[PDB]
Amino acid sequence: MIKRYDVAEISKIWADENKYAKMLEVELAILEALEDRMVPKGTAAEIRARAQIRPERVDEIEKVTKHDIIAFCTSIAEQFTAETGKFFHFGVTSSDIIDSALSLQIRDSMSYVIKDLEALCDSLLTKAEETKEIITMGRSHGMFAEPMSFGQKFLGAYVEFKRRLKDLKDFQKDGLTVQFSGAVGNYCILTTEDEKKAADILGLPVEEVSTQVIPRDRIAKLISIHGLIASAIERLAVEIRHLHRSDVFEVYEGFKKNPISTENLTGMARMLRSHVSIALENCVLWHERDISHSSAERFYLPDNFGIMVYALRRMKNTIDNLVVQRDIIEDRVRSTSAYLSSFYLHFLVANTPFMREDCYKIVQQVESFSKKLQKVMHDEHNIILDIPEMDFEGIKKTYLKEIDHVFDRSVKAR
Amino acid sequence: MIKRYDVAEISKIWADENKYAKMLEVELAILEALEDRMVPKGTAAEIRARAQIRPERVDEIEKVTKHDIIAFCTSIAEQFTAETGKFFHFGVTSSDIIDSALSLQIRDSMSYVIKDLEALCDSLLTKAEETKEIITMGRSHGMFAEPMSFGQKFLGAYVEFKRRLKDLKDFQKDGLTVQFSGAVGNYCILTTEDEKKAADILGLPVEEVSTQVIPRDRIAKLISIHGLIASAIERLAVEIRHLHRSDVFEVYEGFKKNPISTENLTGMARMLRSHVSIALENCVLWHERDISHSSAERFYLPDNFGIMVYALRRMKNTIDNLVVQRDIIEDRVRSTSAYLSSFYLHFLVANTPFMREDCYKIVQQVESFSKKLQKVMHDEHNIILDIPEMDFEGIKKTYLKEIDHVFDRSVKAR
Amino acid sequence: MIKRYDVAEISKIWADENKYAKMLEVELAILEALEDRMVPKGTAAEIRARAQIRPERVDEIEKVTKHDIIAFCTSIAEQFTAETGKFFHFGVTSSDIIDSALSLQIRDSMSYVIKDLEALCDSLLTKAEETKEIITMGRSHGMFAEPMSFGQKFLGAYVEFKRRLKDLKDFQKDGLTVQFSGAVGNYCILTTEDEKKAADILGLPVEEVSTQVIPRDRIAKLISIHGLIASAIERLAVEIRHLHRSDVFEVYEGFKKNPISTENLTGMARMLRSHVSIALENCVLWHERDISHSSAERFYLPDNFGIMVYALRRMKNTIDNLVVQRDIIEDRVRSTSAYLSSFYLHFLVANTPFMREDCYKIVQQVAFDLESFSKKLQKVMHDEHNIILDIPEMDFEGIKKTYLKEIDHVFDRSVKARGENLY
Amino acid sequence: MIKRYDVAEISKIWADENKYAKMLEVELAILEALEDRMVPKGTAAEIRARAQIRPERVDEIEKVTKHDIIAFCTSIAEQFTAETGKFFHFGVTSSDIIDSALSLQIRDSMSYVIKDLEALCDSLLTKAEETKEIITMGRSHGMFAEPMSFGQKFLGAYVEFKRRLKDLKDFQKDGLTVQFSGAVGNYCILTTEDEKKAADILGLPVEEVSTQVIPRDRIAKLISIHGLIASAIERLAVEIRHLHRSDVFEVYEGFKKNPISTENLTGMARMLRSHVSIALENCVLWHERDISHSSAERFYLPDNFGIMVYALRRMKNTIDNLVVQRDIIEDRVRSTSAYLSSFYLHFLVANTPFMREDCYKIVQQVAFDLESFSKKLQKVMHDEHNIILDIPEMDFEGIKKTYLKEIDHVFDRSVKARGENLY
Ligand SMILES: Nc1ncnc2c1ncn2[C@@H]1O[C@H](COP(=O)(O)O)[C@@H](O)[C@H]1O
Ligand SMILES: Nc1ncnc2c1ncn2[C@@H]1O[C@H](COP(=O)(O)O)[C@@H](O)[C@H]1O
Ligand SMILES: Nc1ncnc2c1ncn2[C@@H]1O[C@H](COP(=O)(O)O)[C@@H](O)[C@H]1O
Ligand SMILES: Nc1ncnc2c1ncn2[C@@H]1O[C@H](COP(=O)(O)O)[C@@H](O)[C@H]1O
Ligand SMILES: [Cl-]
Ligand SMILES: [Cl-]
Ligand SMILES: [Cl-]
Ligand SMILES: [Cl-]
Ligand SMILES: [K+]
Ligand SMILES: [K+]
Ligand SMILES: [K+]
Ligand SMILES: [K+]
Ligand SMILES: [K+]
Ligand SMILES: [K+]
**Would you call D59 exposed, middle or buried from its count of C-beta atoms within 10 A (0-12, 13-18, 19+)?**
middle
B191 with A406: CB under 8 angstroms?
Answer: no
Cβ of B231 under 8 Å from any chain D Cβ?
no
Spatial separation of the C-alpha atoms in residues C390 and B11, rounded to whole Å: 75
Q: Nearest CA to D325 among D205, D245, D220?
A: D245
Q: From start to end of C122-183, where are the E strands?
A: 135-140, 143-149
Distance (Å) of CA B223 to CA A228, B316, C282: 11, 21, 21
Probe residue for ligand 1, chosen from A58, A67, A295 as the CB with the greatest number of ligand atoms within 8 Å? A67
| CB-neighbour burial class of residue C353 (10 A; exposed 0-12, middle 13-18, buried 19+) | exposed
In whole angstroms, what is the distance from residue B72 CA to residue B61 CA?
8
Ion ligand 5 nearby residues (CB, 5 A) = C 408, 411
CB atoms within 10 A of CB A2: 15
Nearest to A195 by CA among A43, A45, A93, A303: A93
Taking the CA of residue B94 and the nearest CA in chain A, the distance in Å comes to 12
- Do B352 and B414 lie in one domain? The reply is yes
- Reduce the DSSP state of residue D284 to 3 states and report it: coil
Residues near ion ligand 9 (Cβ under 5 Å): A 247; C 247
Helix (H) or strand (E) holding B65: helix B55-65
* Contact (CB<8Å) D287/C139: yes
- For residue C40, give the DSSP letter: P
Looking at the CA of C413, name the nearest ligand.
13
Q: What is the DSSP letter of D160?
A: H
How was this model experimentally determined? X-ray
CA distance B299 to C226: 18
Residue D174: CATH number of its domain: 1.20.200.10
Instruction: Report the sign of the C-alpha dihedral through residues B183, B185, B186, B189, in that order.
Output: positive
Q: What are the phi and psi torsion angles at D143 (to 5°)?
A: -100, 145
SS3 C188: coil
Distance in Å, CA A248 to ligand 9 centroid: 5
D280 vs D301: CA distance, rounded Å: 13
From the list C422, D310, C264, the residue with the least C-alpha distance to B290 is: C264
Residue A229 neighbours by CB under 8 Å, 6+ apart: A117, A161, A164, A272, A308
3-state DSSP call for residue C419?
Answer: coil
- Does A405 reach chain B within 8 Å, measured CB to CB? yes
- Alpha carbon distances (Å) from A131 to A253, A322, D277: 16, 12, 37
Ligand 4: residues within 6 Å at CB?
Answer: A 4, 258, 260, 264; C 140; D 66-69, 94-95, 212, 291, 294-295
User: Sign of the C-alpha dihedral, residues C358, C364, C370, C371?
Assistant: positive
Q: What's the Cα-to-Cα distance from D294 to each of A266, B93, B130, B284, C94, rounded to whole Å?
A: 10, 39, 56, 20, 49
Say how far apart CA A181 and CA A187 lie, in whole Å: 5
Phi, psi of C249, deg, nearest 5: 50, 45
CB A158 within 8 A of CB A128: yes
Residues B308 and B350 in one domain: no
Task: Tell me, yes or no, whether B54 and B99 share the same domain.
Answer: no
The dihedral over CA atoms of C59, C64, C68, C72, expressed in degrees to the nearest 10, equals -70
Nearest Cβ partner for B281 among C4, C241, C270: C270
Q: b/e map of C298-317 (b: 16 or more CB within 10 Å)?
A: bbbbbbbbbbbbbbbbbbbb
Give me ligand 3 centre to Cα C19, in Å: 15
Q: Which residue's CA is minimally distant from atom 11 of ligand 1?
A: A67
Q: What is the DSSP string of C5-35?
A: G--HHHHHHHSHHHHHHHHHHHHHHHHHHGG
Choosing among B247, B250, B273, B328, which should be mutated to test the D contact, i.e. which has the most D CBs within 10 A? Answer: B247
Interatomic CA distance for residues C288 and A136, integer angstroms: 63
In this structure, which ligand is nearest to the CA of C411? 5
Give whole-number Cα distances, A365 to A358, A377, A389, C297, in Å: 10, 12, 19, 58
At B328, which helix (H) or strand (E)?
Answer: helix B326-334
Q: Which of A206, A205, A181, A201 is nearest to A45 (CA)?
A: A201
Binding residues of A for AMP: 66-68, 141, 289, 294, 298
Select from C236, C243, C250, C221 the least CA-distant residue to C312: C236
B277–C contact, CB cutoff 8 A: yes
CA D70 to ligand 4 centroid distance, Å: 10
Residues C274 and C154 in one domain: yes
CA separation for the pair D419, C208 (Å, rounded)? 14
Residue after which a domain boundary falls, among B70, B92, B114: B92
d(CA B138, CA A212): 9
Going by the DSSP 8-state scheme, the letter that residue D250 receives in this structure is S
Question: Where is the domain boundary, A33, A61, A92?
Answer: A92
Cα C380 from Cα B318, distance rounded (Å): 89
Environment class of A3 (CB within 10 Å of its CB; exposed 0-12, middle 13-18, buried 19+): exposed
End position of a domain, from candidates C288, C311, C336: C336
Cβ–Cβ under 8 Å, residues B221 and A229: no
∠ CA D143-D148-D153, nearest 5°, is 85
Q: Positive or negative, the Cα torsion across A64, A70, A72, A74?
A: negative
Query: Would you give the end-to-end CA distance of chain A in angstroms?
Result: 41
Pairwise CA distance, residues D227 & C224, whole Å: 9
Closest among D173, D27, D179 to D90, alpha carbons compared: D27
Q: How far apart are CA C318 and CA B107, in angstroms?
A: 36
- Domain with A227, as residue range(s), is 93-336
Evaluate: CB of A291 within 6 angstroms of ligand 1: yes
Beta bridge partners of A178: A206
Contact flag A271-D300 (C-beta cutoff 8 Å) = yes
Nearest to C199 by CA among C177, C214, C217: C177
CA dihedral C208, C209, C210, C216 (to 10 degrees): -90
From atom 2 of ligand 4, which residue's Cα is the shortest distance away? Answer: D94
Closest to D89 in 3D by CA, of D132, D43, D134, D129: D43
Q: How many CB atoms lie within 10 A of CB C389?
A: 15
Kindly write down the DSSP assignment for every residue of B103-147, as one continuous string.
HHHHHHHHHHHHHHHHHHHHHHHHHHHHHTT-EEEEEETTEEEEE
Burial environment of residue C383 by CB neighbours within 10 A (0 to 12, 13 to 18, 19 or more): exposed
Nearest to A85 by CA among A118, A50, A54: A50
In chain D, how many domains are there?
Answer: 3
Dihedral (CA of A207, A212, A217, A219) sign: positive
For ligand 3, is residue C104 a contact (CB within 6 Å)? no
From D14, D69, D93, mutation site for ligand 4 pocket: most ligand atoms within 8 A of C-beta: D69
Distances (CA, A) of B288 to A369, B75, B285, D286: 27, 28, 8, 19
Neighboring chains of B (3 or more beta-carbon pairs < 8 A) = A, C, D
Asked if C253 and C136 sit in the same domain, the reply is: yes
Alpha-carbon gap, residue C31 to C36, rounded angstroms: 9
Residue B253, C-beta contacts closer than 8 angstroms, at least 6 positions apart: B240, B244, B259, B260, B261, B262, B318, B321, B322, B323
Please tell me which of the candidates D4, D255, D275 has its beta carbon nearest to residue A274. Answer: D275
Which of C246, C264, C336 to substitute to test the interface with A, most A CBs within 10 Å? Answer: C246
Whether residue A319 is found in the same domain as residue A343: no
Q: Is B79 exposed, middle or buried (0-12, 13-18, 19+ CB in 10 A)?
A: middle
Q: Is C353 on the interface with A (CB under 8 A)?
A: no
Could you give the CA distance from residue C349 to residue C355 in angstroms, rounded to a whole number? 6
**What residues contact A230, with CB distance under 8 A and at least 6 apart?**
A268, A269, A270, A272, A273, B280
Of A141, A242, A246, the CB nearest to C144: A246
Rounded Cα gap, residues B305 and B299, in angstroms: 11
- Counting ligands in written order, the one closest to the CA of D335 is 11
> At A401, which CATH number?
1.10.40.30
CA distance B6 to B207: 33
Measured in Å, residue C415 CA sits from the centre of ligand 5 at: 10
Helix (H/G/I), strand (E/B), else coil: C146: strand
Q: Are residues D99 and D212 in the same domain?
A: yes
Phi-psi region of D40 (alpha: psi -120 to 50; beta: other; left: phi over 0): beta
- How far is the C-alpha of C249 from the C-alpha of C230, rounded, in Å? 25
Query: Closest-lying ligand to the alpha carbon of A139?
Result: 2
Which chain D residues touch C215 with a CB distance below 8 Å? 156, 160
Single-letter residue type at D66: K
> How far is Cα D77 from Cα B258, in angstroms, rounded to an integer?
71
CA distance C242 to C259: 9
Q: How many whole angstroms separate alpha carbon C277 and alpha carbon C300?
A: 11
Q: How far is CA D399 from the centre of its chain?
A: 36
B293 and B174 in one domain?
yes
3-state secondary structure C314-367: HHHHHHHHCEECHHHHHHHHHCCCCCHHHHHHHHHHHHCCCCHHHHHHHHHHHH
Instruction: Return the closest-CA partner of residue C31 out of C150, C183, C146, C197.
Output: C197
**Count of CA atoms in the C-beta half-sphere (13 A) of C277:** 30
CB environment B252-267: b (16+ within 10 A), e (fewer): bbeeeebbbbbbbbbb
Nearest to A186 among B142, B146, B191 (CB): B146
Say which residues have a Cβ less than 8 Å from residue A56's Cβ, sequence separation at least 6. none
Give me the residues of A, 237-266, that contact D with CB < 8 A: 241, 255, 260, 263-264, 266
Q: How far is CA D212 from the centre of its chain?
A: 31
Largest CA distance in chain D: 107
**Cβ neighbours of C260 in B, within 8 Å:** 291
Looking from the CA of B114 toward its CB, the CA atoms found within 13 Å total: 16
HEC string of chain A equals CCHHHCCHHHHHHHCHHHHHHHHHHHHHHHHHHHHHCCCCCCHHHHHHHHCCCCHHHHHHHHHHHCCHHHHHHHHHHCCCCCCCCCCCCCCCCHHHHHHHHHHHHHHHHHHHHHHHHHHHHHHHHHHHHHHCCCEEEEEECCEEEEEEECHHHHHHHHHHHHHHHHHHHHHHHCCCCECCCCCCCCCCCCCHHHHHHHHHHHCCCECCCCCCCCCCHHHHHHHHHHHHHHHHHHHHHHHHHHHHCCCCCCEECCCCCCCHHHHHHHHHHHHHHHHHHHHHHCCCCCCCCCCHHHHHHHHHHHHHHHHHHHHHHHHHHHHHHCEECHHHHHHHHHCCCCCHHHHHHHHHHHHCCCCHHHHHHHHHHCCCHHHHHHHHHHHHHCCCCCCCCCCHHHHHHHHCCCHHHHHHHHCCCC
- CA distance linking residue A237 with residue D398, whole number of Å: 70
Contact B185/B246 with Cβ under 8 angstroms? Answer: no
Report d(CA C275, CA C107) in Å as an integer: 18
Length of chain A, in residues: 414
What separation in angstroms does the CA of B386 have from each of A405, B365, C110, C119, C334?
76, 20, 75, 86, 99
Q: What are phi and psi of B352, to 5 degrees?
A: -130, 165
DSSP code of C226? H
A127 burial class (0-12, 13-18, 19+ CB within 10 angstroms)? buried
In degrees and rounded to multiples of 5, residue B145 shows phi and psi of: -120, -75
**Cα of C235 to ligand 4 centre, how many Å?**
21
Measured distance CA(C268)–CA(C274) in Å, rounded: 10
Q: Which of residues 125-154 of D touch B (CB under 8 A)?
A: 137, 139-144
Q: How far apart are the first and last CA of chain D?
A: 48
Q: DSSP letters along B3-16, please?
A: GGG--HHHHHHHSH
Same domain, A356 and A309: no
What sign does the dihedral B303-B306-B308-B311 (CA atoms) show?
Answer: negative
Contact B119, A172 (CB under 8 A): no
Which contiguous run of DSSP H or E holds residue D411? helix D407-414
**Residues A281 and A407 reside in one and the same domain:** no
Q: How far is CA B307 from CA B227, B228, B295, B314, in A?
A: 12, 14, 19, 10
Q: Are residues D88 and D76 in contact, defined by beta-carbon separation less than 8 angstroms?
A: yes
Give Cα D21 distance to the centre of its chain: 28
Closest by CA position to B297, among listed B226, B219, B221: B219
Give the position, in ligand 2's atom list, of the atom nearest the Cα of B289: 1
Residues 6+ apart with CB under 8 A from B335: none
Ligand 9 centroid from CA A339, angstroms: 18
Distance CA D29, CA D219 (A): 22
Cβ–Cβ below 8 Å for D277 and A274: yes
Tally the C-alpha atoms within 13 A of residue B271's C-alpha that lie toward its C-beta.
30
Packed helices D260-281 and D292-321: angle between N→C axes, nearest 10 degrees: 160
Q: Rounded to whole angstroms, how far apart are CA atoms C85 and C88?
A: 5
- In 3D space, the residue among C86, C2, C160, D35 whose CA is nearest the CA of residue B297 turns out to be C2
Spatial distance between the Cα atoms of B225 and B168, rounded to a whole number of angstroms: 7
Q: Are residues D40 and D116 in the same domain?
A: no
Question: What gap in Å lies between CA D103 and CA D344, rounded to an integer?
Answer: 61
Contact D158, D316 (CB under 8 A): no
* C-alpha radius of gyration, chain C, whole number: 31
CATH code, domain with D50: 1.10.275.10
B71 and B145, same domain (yes or no): no
